[PDB]
Amino acid sequence: SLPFGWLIVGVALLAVFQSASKIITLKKRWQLALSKGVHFVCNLLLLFVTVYSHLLLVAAGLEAPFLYLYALVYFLQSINFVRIIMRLWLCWKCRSKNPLLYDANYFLCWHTNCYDYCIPYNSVTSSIVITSGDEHDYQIGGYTEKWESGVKDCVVLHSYFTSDYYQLYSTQLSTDTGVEHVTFFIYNKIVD
Amino acid sequence: SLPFGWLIVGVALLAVFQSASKIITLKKRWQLALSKGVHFVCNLLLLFVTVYSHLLLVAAGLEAPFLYLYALVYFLQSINFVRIIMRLWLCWKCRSKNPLLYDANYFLCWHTNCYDYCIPYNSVTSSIVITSGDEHDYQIGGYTEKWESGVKDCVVLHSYFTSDYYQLYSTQLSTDTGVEHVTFFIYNKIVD
């Protein structure tokens, strides 16, 4: 007494959303969110699908070779949910919406009285270069963000669990490097 | 005369692989490949699943409200395949395996007689900073790569379609910035 067309519609919709998820380019900010939105729906759909599939086996009574598989599926989904919770915790720590949009491992962040800056970053490095200027923008590795306040002497590389501290040593003006309308700030990791 | 348990096994396996795809962290190189490998399998599974589902409708004869949906699915999958082909073309242009592993929009590349360097990059910027040194490594935005040869005066930002040229202006030594065992190279985009 369980419908089948609902299962087929759900799997078709999951295919649609997952296929569209591989088409959205991650260049502009809003598209990023849209991509995540699509992903979210896809994720939900997947859950529904597999959950519904389990119910189908309940009608079939073939749980003997599938209970381990579905336990693994639910365990991995639970780990994914914990990962989303940790992502929200990192968002709260970085007090900006950037961690949800981007998939970077680490986030270079710093606070000002009027704005908070959070930029994606791949791995912990012994030094970090912040490029201002060219409508001033702060960009790291191509990831850019609008300028509203000046830089800070100390910045924090935030992660899921650990956080590192970076201190400014050298500020490079245009007259030093020769690049027009661009200023470089150099930070290095401190040890305590 | 078409099996159903094959469909349920395929959708369960797709759920397993897609759920595991959201667990692999993108920190070390090999994991990256593994992630893509999993993704690849997931993608294939998805195709199979939806393809099989279409065949099921062939048995049902309910193509009236589903032919548009499956045409959209196949169109998006074809666009995804074209995207993979363009990714392989960009890999050949960058003549290294980095573009397959990473998901960056652009790739900063340069050739030497003994090695070719290709580093992920987010967006086209008016300037680029290459950080050498700390076992010397070249790292942009946290994405690091082993050092085997010296830098080049000209580097290329490669994309799916267009390519930009970046020329070196300033090289920052340790004695200038104060950072120990780290050297910074400054490039800017040229106009022709």
Residue numbers in the entry:
A (entry chain B), B (entry chain A): 40 to 173, 181 to 238
List sentences from the manuscript.
The severe acute respiratory syndrome associated coronavirus 2 (SARS-CoV-2) and SARS-CoV-1 accessory protein Orf3a colocalizes with markers of the plasma membrane, endocytic pathway, and Golgi apparatus. Cryo-EM structures of both SARS-CoV-2 and SARS-CoV-1 Orf3a display a narrow constriction and the presence of a positively charged aqueous vestibule, which would not favor cation permeation. To explain this difference, we find that a divergent, unstructured loop of SARS-CoV-2 Orf3a facilitates its binding with VPS39, a HOPS complex tethering protein involved in late endosome and autophagosome fusion with lysosomes.
We first evaluated the oligomeric state of SARS-CoV-2 Orf3a2x-STREP in cell membranes by chemical crosslinking and concluded that it likely assembles as a 64 kDa dimer. The overall architecture of SARS-CoV-2 Orf3a is a dimer and is comprised of six transmembrane (TM) helices, three provided by each subunit, with dimensions of 50 Å in diameter and 70 Å in height. Extending from TM3 is a 104 amino acid structured cytosolic domain assembled from a cluster of eight β-sheets (β1–8) contributed by each SARS-CoV-2 Orf3a subunit, forming a compact and continuous molecular surface that protrudes 30 Å into the cytosol. The final approximately one-third of the TM region positioned above the cytosolic domain contains a ~12 Å diameter aqueous vestibule which is accessible from the cytosol through two narrow portals. Although the portal could permit the movement of partially hydrated cations (1.5 Å radius), the composition of residues lining the aqueous vestibule is highly basic (K61, K75, H78, R122, R126) creating a positively-charged region that would not be suitable for cations. Within the SARS-CoV-2 Orf3a transmembrane region are two distinct lateral fenestrations that expose the aqueous vestibule to the lipid bilayer formed between the structured loop of TM1 and TM3 (Lipid Site 1) and between TM2 and TM3 (Lipid Site 2). A notable arginine residue (R122) located in TM3 neighbors both lipid sites and, in its current conformation, stabilizes the phospholipid phosphate group in Lipid Site 1.
